[PDB]
Design a protein around this nucleic acid. Structure first.
Lengths: 103, 61, 144, 119, 338, 83, 187, 100, 138, 23
RNA sequence: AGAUCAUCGAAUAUAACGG
RNA sequence: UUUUUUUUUUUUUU
RNA sequence: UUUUAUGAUCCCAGGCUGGUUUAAUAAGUCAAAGUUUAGCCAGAGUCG
RNA sequence: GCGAGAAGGGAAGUGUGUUUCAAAG
């Protein structure tokens, strides 16, 4: 939790903007594409510390869904959240693929 | 008035107060008091809200 | 059937602002004899009777839901759809009547009814006046 | 036209033969062996329709996760058992009915499941 | 077999111009043998928010499977504007679409037969059925389980804002005896929903109850516009005065009515009107009557009282109808208390 | 335009209403006019503050501070009040 | 202490509950809607606790024991009980309710309530009942009597009587009005 | 650690929001709209009316033991609510709370 | 006593009470109609006080000079879209009663179509003549 | 002219204060 | 509906699935 | 199917 | 096939937030990593 | 007929809460 005066500093606002995306979108790279029509997207987030005034990074691995199964391992993609639960692990939907690794 | 005993039109103006005499702001923030209990919807229409107002809303410029 | 019983749509839209009952009020319904139970209002039979009536017949399969990303969209300001078309001159004179001395004497000059106290005649007359001022303010706020 | 009617008694042998509750892995393979559905339907065809139909949620297949994990299972994977839903006799009947028509309407001039379309 | 499509939710800017609509069909498929369309028109000459398209003779369209239908639907769905529904039409529903257009044109014409006092305690309602309904289709009902040969051309159906068949269906009866018999056995009935593939569709529970009445008279339109809270009462004893007879006996009961009116016609039953000041008084009266009814052992289904209302009307030389007015403020008279 | 007042109305608590409050120090209590629901507590959640009221003042004349641009706006929404 | 619960005549034996209500041990201010009405200044529930089972020793049994209903006081005699002894079952007669000797109007805890007028410092128009059809289920205190309800004006005589009204036809023959207390008629 | 008795948090009847919806016609945010009725249901009254009613047992939490030790002296624990209609019975006594 | 209140504290004398309408009175009513909006709220609340008469008498006079002549020269269509709606319940009202609608007759509204119902030749085949009362023209 | 209603006089002061602050 | 550092008690770690 | 009913209805063949 | 030092398996205890003035060229424009007092949200079921 | 737990600390750690948005039964 952040105090009222902690929500107006440039350090916190800058971190917020980086994390914040349209439709709560995220950026990550796929690390597992073994199961059919399934890909695990590894997203990286950021956080601010009001004590030492330094920002660190922590990975957030999540599961996604692909229709055409165009994405492959080691390919940065875009994910979008959803207001339901489908499958045991599936919690995201693909939109597009930015980069493609050769084979 | 004295005879009619009704309020007059022209009278003394207001008496605004300023802290430490200074009454100048160079970087005014964007306050949320422009639309009290009113917001914009996805459609663009005006809708209300249900929230407790901040006790120190005006004391935190 | 099982989730929601047979409930007419007319009685569902009207019951919107109905406050839910409290803890003690719930026990009254549950207390025996259950004389507040209506026709086809049983909580034991209604939940299985409906199901069986539909078993004889075919069952429509659930719709096929295919996930699809939602495109991004930016906020856009829009004008007010509801704006009463009334001139400001008309409302100026109407405000002087309710707030003027004529309102006080209007309440006194009212016809009484059998079975009602003298204060009731003026109270109801004042209530009708209070309904007109609400519309005037609502129209003015929307126009501005 | 003139779709055949699936007798209740016939389905009893298939359900009991594959074996109260049973797993869904043995039922998928046994359905094709009996040939009750009749190109040849592949194993993946049934699996794809099972997920698209949203049967795991409807039937409450994820309720068994809280029995082992408990509070940790409430959160999503990233914010975990993944066993399939064990359909019973009652449950299986419904699914057979649903999948029987999903294949007939795939080539009919007048769709039955989803006839509408949005621009 | 395929015989055409059905459009809906069309914008007003395309239904009012035949040139633009015809051009959109030529590129997708056959041009306006060529295909034919039919635009629904209201009694006042205004169009609707939907249209219909008919395919050429079946000789050149009998051999058409789903492979050729999916592509045609898809291609013809993109050209029109957004927020549009393009569904297929079967051989059975195709004949029903024509009746839908005719009902809208004859809506006002059909709301005159049996509406007057002639047929008071006859009219019924059952807003169970969905858009899937017809005069012929519904005729088989109320005969196999209730035994009641109702008239054919006495069936009326309301409509929603988008000229869509409202689920609210209303029926009538020739005689009065059978009226009661209809609203006692039609409770929780599941005949069928749709007849496709020679098999029945989803389930639907029937529910018949008297909750609405109709009246048409020359001395009712004007009196029912002055007050804001107007009541209706009927099923009274032998012929009675207003000031001398109706007022005096009212004291015994708990009507609490500011004013009253009469209803001539020369029948063996009277019907006096009531007026209230506030909405709360009106509301409380409703309860009172209801309670009393039970005590008297009159009947649950027996019409005893009702609430008067003014039906929406659409005049000419008007840019917007009263019912479609978004700036109306006729809701402040109903205060909310909880 | 009833759609614009939907959020205001509360199913659990009730419709909006205008009343007063009791707060301050013992022996010098002052009234505070606010807007809240029907079942809400006398001293608790409040939607908007309209003003205050001081029936006892050193000058001997009762004071009353109110907002002319908010009271009229709230009445249009259908807010009741006590006698 | 409260009176023990008893079943009325014409009812099979029931099983008594262990507690008056669900929240017996935990809560104490909660009250059941079907609570008994035995404290002075109330009325019974008609057909729930008005006529409990009556028992007496073999020695006390007699014909007169069965005739207790018909000899009840004026303040407790209902319509059913009254019509049973009248000629022709009280058919082709008139009846009216006299709300002047109610138990709560003279005795009871809340017997000094403040009315809208205050206190009473000092020819009426009372309703008249004409029983047409009479059907007795559980004699002598139960029946489905259908009659014509009308209004009538009282006379100036010392007693409560009905001179030349009923005059107006109010409603067709319907169910009874009240089941608390009734008076005689001219017939 | 196998077949260990776990514990789940309590949850009462969620009151529905005033600003609800019947059926979302193609929603265009990233979530599901609330409901007015919510947990509660509308039934026909005895006197020909419409009123609220406590639905069938709302997810009786069997995982947590009774708090008051003196519960067996006044209430019979280990109860079952069965649904039967003529010769038909359905299996719905298991009240499990699925994941969000 | 309820009878004493209606006899003692009830005697409002109205100036223009139980009087016929004259030529000057008709002009005065028309002038007030323009000053106060008619299709906005209750216009009869303020006009009645100016004329010193009952709220019902004033409405009838205006309805027989403007409303009737105007409504008799316009086409009207009967629809039920907004009128069909229930009433919100409350703590003293938890029931769904009946209703009664008002349909205008031909004596006060010229309800006639502007164009006969025309059907195309190909679309006329799918029409049941045994399910309709009115004949098929053209 | 000659604002007799209390509402009219109350709004007069609001405009005067806002005009001074406007530049 | 999305996002949303864990801390103390000194400490002691690889576990559950299918051939 | 059996006691309770101030929530209903139905009964014919030239 | 899945988690796992960016803490997977696993034992005990702690429920989250707001509160107006507040001196010093630390003159705070929100009291500057973390301090509270009328207050918001939230807190299972049972008469067999 | 209507209102009534207005005296509740027993459950839970990635939970309870906070923040950003949305909601024409």
């Amino acid at each position: 939790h952040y105090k009222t005066w902690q929500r107006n500093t440039a350090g916190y606002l800058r971190t917020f903007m980086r994390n914040k995306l349209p439709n709560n979108e995220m950026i990550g790279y796929v690390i597992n594409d073994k199961h059919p029509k399934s890909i695990r997207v590894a997203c990286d987030r950021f956080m601010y510390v009001m004590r030492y005034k330094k920002t660190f990074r922590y990975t957030k691995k999540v599961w996604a869904h692909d229709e055409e199964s165009e994405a492959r391992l080691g390919d940065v993609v875009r994910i979008q959240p959803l207001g339901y639960r489908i499958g045991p692990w599936k919690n995201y939907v693909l939109v597009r693929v930015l980069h493609k690794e050769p084979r | 008035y004295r005879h009619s005993g009704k309020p007059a039109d022209w009278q003394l103006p207001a008496r605004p107060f300023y802290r430490q005499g200074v009454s100048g702001l160079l970087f005014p923030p964007r306050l949320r008091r422009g639309f009290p209990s009113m917001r914009v919807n996805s459609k663009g229409q005006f809708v209300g809200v249900n929230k407790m107002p901040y006790i120190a809303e005006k004391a935190q410029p | 059937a099982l989730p929601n019983p047979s409930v007419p749509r007319a009685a569902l839209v009207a019951a919107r602002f109905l406050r839910p009952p409290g803890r003690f009020k719930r026990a009254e319904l549950r207390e025996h004899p259950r004389s507040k139970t209506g026709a086809f209002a049983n909580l034991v039979k209604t939940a299985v009777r409906l199901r069986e009536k539909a078993r004889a017949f075919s069952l429509v399969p659930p719709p096929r839901l295919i996930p699809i990303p939602l495109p991004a969209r930016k906020k856009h300001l829009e004008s007010v759809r509801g704006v009463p078309t009334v001139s400001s001159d008309v409302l100026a004179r109407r405000l002087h009547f309710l707030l003027g001395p004529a309102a006080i004497e209007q309440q006194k000059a009212a016809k009484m009814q059998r079975g009602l106290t003298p204060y009731q005649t003026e109270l109801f007359m004042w209530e009708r006046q209070m309904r007109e001022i609400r519309k005037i303010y609502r129209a003015q706020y929307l126009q501005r | 036209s003139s779709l055949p009617r699936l007798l209740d008694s016939e389905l009893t042998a298939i359900f009991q033969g594959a074996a109260i509750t049973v797993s869904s892995n043995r039922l998928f393979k046994a359905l094709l062996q009996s040939g009750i559905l009749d190109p040849v339907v592949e194993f993946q065809k049934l699996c794809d329709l099972y997920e698209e139909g949203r049967f795991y949620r409807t039937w409450a297949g994820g309720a068994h996760i809280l029995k082992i994990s408990g509070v940790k299972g409430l959160a999503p994977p990233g914010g975990i058992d993944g066993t399939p839903k064990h359909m019973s006799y009652e449950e299986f009947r419904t699914f057979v009915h649903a999948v029987r028509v999903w294949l007939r309407d795939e080539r009919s001039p007048v769709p039955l499941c989803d006839a509408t379309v949005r621009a | 077999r395929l015989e055409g499509f059905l459009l809906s939710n069309l914008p007003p800017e395309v239904t009012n111009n035949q040139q633009l609509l015809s051009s959109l069909l030529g590129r997708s498929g056959l041009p306006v043998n060529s295909a034919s369309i039919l635009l629904q028109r209201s009694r006042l000459g205004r169009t609707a928010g939907r249209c219909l398209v008919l395919l050429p003779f079946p000789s050149s369209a009998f051999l058409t499977g789903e492979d050729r239908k999916a592509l045609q639907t898809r291609l013809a769905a993109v050209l029109p504007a957004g927020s549009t529904v393009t569904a297929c039409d079967r051989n059975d529903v195709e004949n029903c679409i024509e009746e839908f257009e005719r009902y809208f044109f004859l809506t006002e014409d059909l709301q005159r037969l049996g509406v007057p006092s002639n047929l008071r305690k006859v009219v019924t309602l059952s807003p169970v059925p969905p858009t899937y309904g017809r005069r012929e289709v519904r005729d088989l009902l109320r005969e196999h389980a209730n035994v009641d040969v109702d008239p054919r051309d006495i069936v009326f159906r309301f409509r929603k804002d988008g000229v869509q068949g409202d689920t609210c269906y209303v029926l009538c009866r020739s005689e009065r005896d059978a009226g009661v018999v209809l609203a006692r056995i039609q409770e929780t009935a599941v005949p069928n929903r749709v007849h496709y593939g020679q098999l029945f569709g989803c389930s639907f529970l029937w529910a018949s109850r008297s909750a609405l009445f109709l009246c048409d008279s020359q001395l009712d339109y004007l009196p029912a516009r002055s007050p804001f809270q107007v009541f209706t009462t009927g099923w009274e004893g032998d012929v009675s005065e207003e000031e001398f007879k109706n007022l005096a006996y009212q004291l015994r009961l708990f009507p609490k009515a500011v004013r009253k009116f009469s209803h001539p016609g020369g029948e063996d039953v009277s019907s006096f009107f009531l007026e209230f000041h506030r909405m709360r008084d009106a509301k409380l009266t409703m309860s009172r009557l209801q309670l009393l009814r039970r005590r008297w052992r009159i009947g649950a289904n027996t019409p005893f009282f009702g609430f008067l209302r003014m039906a929406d009307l659409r005049f000419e030389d008007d840019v917007k109808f009263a019912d479609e007015d978004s700036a109306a403020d006729s809701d402040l008279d109903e205060p909310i208390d909880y | 335009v009833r759609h614009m007042f939907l959020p205001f109305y509360s199913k659990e608590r009730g419709p909006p209403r205008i009343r007063m409050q009791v707060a301050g120090v013992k022996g010098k209590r002052f009234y505070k006019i606010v807007a809240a629901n029907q079942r809400d507590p006398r001293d608790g959640k409040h939607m908007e503050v309209l003003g205050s009221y001081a029936p006892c003042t050193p000058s001997g004349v009762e004071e009353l501070r109110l907002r002319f641009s908010r009271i009229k706006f709230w009445l249009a929404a259908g807010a009741a009040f006590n006698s | 202490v409260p009176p023990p619960l008893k079943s009325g005549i014409g009812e099979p034996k029931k099983t008594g509950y262990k507690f008056p209500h669900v929240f017996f041990p935990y809560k104490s201010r909660y009250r059941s809607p079907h609570r008994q009405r035995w404290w002075p200044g109330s009325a019974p529930r008609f057909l729930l606790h008005s006529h409990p089972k009556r028992w007496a020793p073999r020695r006390d049994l007699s014909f007169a024991f069965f005739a207790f209903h018909g000899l009840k006081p004026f303040a407790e005699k209902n319509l059913y009980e009254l019509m049973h002894s009248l000629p022709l079952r009280g058919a082709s007669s008139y009846f009216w309710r006299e709300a002047d000797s109610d138990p709560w109007k003279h005795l009871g805890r809340k017997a000094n309530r403040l009315q809208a007028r205050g206190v009473r410092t000092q020819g009426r128009k009372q309703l008249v009942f004409s029983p047409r059809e009479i059907y007795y289920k559980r004699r002598p205190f139960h029946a489905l009597v259908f009659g014509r309800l009308s209004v009538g004006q009282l006379g100036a005589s010392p007693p409560e009587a009905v001179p030349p009204e009923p005059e107006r036809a109010e409603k067709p023959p319907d169910c009874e009005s009240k089941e608390q207390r009734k008076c005689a008629g001219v017939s | 650690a196998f077949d260990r008795l776990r514990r789940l948090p309590n949850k009462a009847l969620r009151p529905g929001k005033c600003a609800g919806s019947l059926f979302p016609s193609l929603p265009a945010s990233v979530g599901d709209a609330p409901s007015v009725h919510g947990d509660f249901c509308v039934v026909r009254r005895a006197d020909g009316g419409f009123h609220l009613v406590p639905p069938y047992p709302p997810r009786i939490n069997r995982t947590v033991e009774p708090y008051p030790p003196s519960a067996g002296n006044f209430y019979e624990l280990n109860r079952q609510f069965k649904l039967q209609w003529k010769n038909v019975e359905y299996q719905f006594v298991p009240k499990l709370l699925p994941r969000p | 006593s309820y009878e004493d209140y209606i006899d003692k504290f009830q005697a409002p004398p109205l100036e223009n009470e139980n009087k016929e309408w004259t030529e000057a009175d008709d002009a005065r009513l028309l002038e007030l109609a323009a000053q106060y909006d008619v299709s906005f709220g209750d216009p009869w609340l303020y006009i009645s006080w100016e004329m010193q008469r009952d709220f019902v008498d004033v409405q009838t006079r205006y309805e027989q000079l403007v409303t009737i002549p105007k409504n008799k020269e316009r086409h009207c269509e009967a629809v039920l879209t907004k009128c069909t709606k229930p009433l919100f319940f409350s703590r003293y009202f938890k029931l769904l009663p009946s209703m009664l609608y008002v349909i205008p007759s031909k004596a006060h509204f010229n309800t006639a179509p502007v164009q006969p119902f025309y059907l195309p030749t190909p679309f006329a085949a799918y029409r049941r003549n045994d399910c309709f009362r009115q004949l098929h023209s053209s | 002219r000659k604002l007799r209603l209390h509402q009219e006089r109350a709004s007069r002061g609001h405009i005067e204060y806002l005009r001074q602050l406007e530049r």
